[PDB]
Design a protein around this ligand. Sequence first.
Ligand SMILES: Cc1nc2c(c(C)c(C)n2Cc2cnn(C)c2)c(-c2ccc(Cl)cc2)c1[C@H](OC(C)(C)C)C(=O)O
Ligand SMILES: Cc1nc2c(c(C)c(C)n2Cc2cnn(C)c2)c(-c2ccc(Cl)cc2)c1[C@H](OC(C)(C)C)C(=O)O
Lengths: 132, 132
Amino acid sequence: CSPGIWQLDCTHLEGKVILVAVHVASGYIEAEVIPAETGQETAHFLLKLAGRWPVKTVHTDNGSNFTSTTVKTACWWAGIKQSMNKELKKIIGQVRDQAEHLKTAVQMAVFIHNHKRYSAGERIVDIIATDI
Amino acid sequence: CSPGIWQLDCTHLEGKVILVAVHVASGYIEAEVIPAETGQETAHFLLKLAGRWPVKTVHTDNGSNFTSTTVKTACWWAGIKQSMNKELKKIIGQVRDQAEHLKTAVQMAVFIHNHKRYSAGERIVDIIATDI
Ligand SMILES: Cc1nc2c(c(C)c(C)n2Cc2cnn(C)c2)c(-c2ccc(Cl)cc2)c1[C@H](OC(C)(C)C)C(=O)O
Ligand SMILES: Cc1nc2c(c(C)c(C)n2Cc2cnn(C)c2)c(-c2ccc(Cl)cc2)c1[C@H](OC(C)(C)C)C(=O)O
């Protein structure tokens, strides 16, 4: 798929919110635990992702996520325009006993996911570099 | 330089702590504002970085940062072994008026830094992909 396309969705576990960004073409995941499913958390996360990868267009499974002027101002500043969450939840459960805080298990599960095999982490750098 | 080498340092601004990871070979930056300069924040950040990039060895300008068993357990789980912060602070000041929270300005400054020109963001993906 096009190299700048990401999917962003907010999922739930242990009464906390996990935001999950997926690089559609590669399967590569950036994920974080946020305290509330607010547009402020979405806006700040978009700004983070955009600084780290070339984020051209964002998709979601909940369009209403992208309606706050907070979020749109982030889409604007960064030049952004407008399945996998059960795999990650699976890995979270596997490693969950290895950590106290859910936020630690999520990053353990992102590590596992992006490096298991190519690996998602290998495909995104190959994709983004080919495009360059 | 070798593709898995990162430098990690904790810098201060507005009475808050900014953790700054630099991909030595490319100049690419991941940075976050943390509430306290604790080993817990360092450990969790290392786990995050390692899931996102191939992090083989970490350097720092404060060795004592890496002495907690919390941090070493993270170095261990991820398979990690053991100048730029004034550039980023410069950009933070420039964009500071554009944001209320310092944490928003930091991600604005990471975005600016990694994409200005190649760009640091282009070099890290080229470096990491060449290695692959
Ligand atoms: C909350 C926490 N405290 C920790 C550690 C460790 C190793 C120690 C010694 N302590 C103090 C302690 C625990 N019991 N006792 C009696 C004293 C870890 C940890 C878990 C897995 C990895 Cl790879 C790396 C660190 C965490 C993790 O949180 C982060 C945010 C990552 C620090 C978590 O969420 O489990
Ligand atoms: C705290 C905050 N509130 C915001 C916005 C926006 C655009 C609106 C409308 N509001 C509510 C508001 C502000 N004044 N009034 C009277 C109502 C932003 C913002 C700033 C720059 C970008 Cl590109 C994108 C969003 C932020 C930023 O924080 C994050 C965590 C990023 C949300 C920040 O740190 O400035």
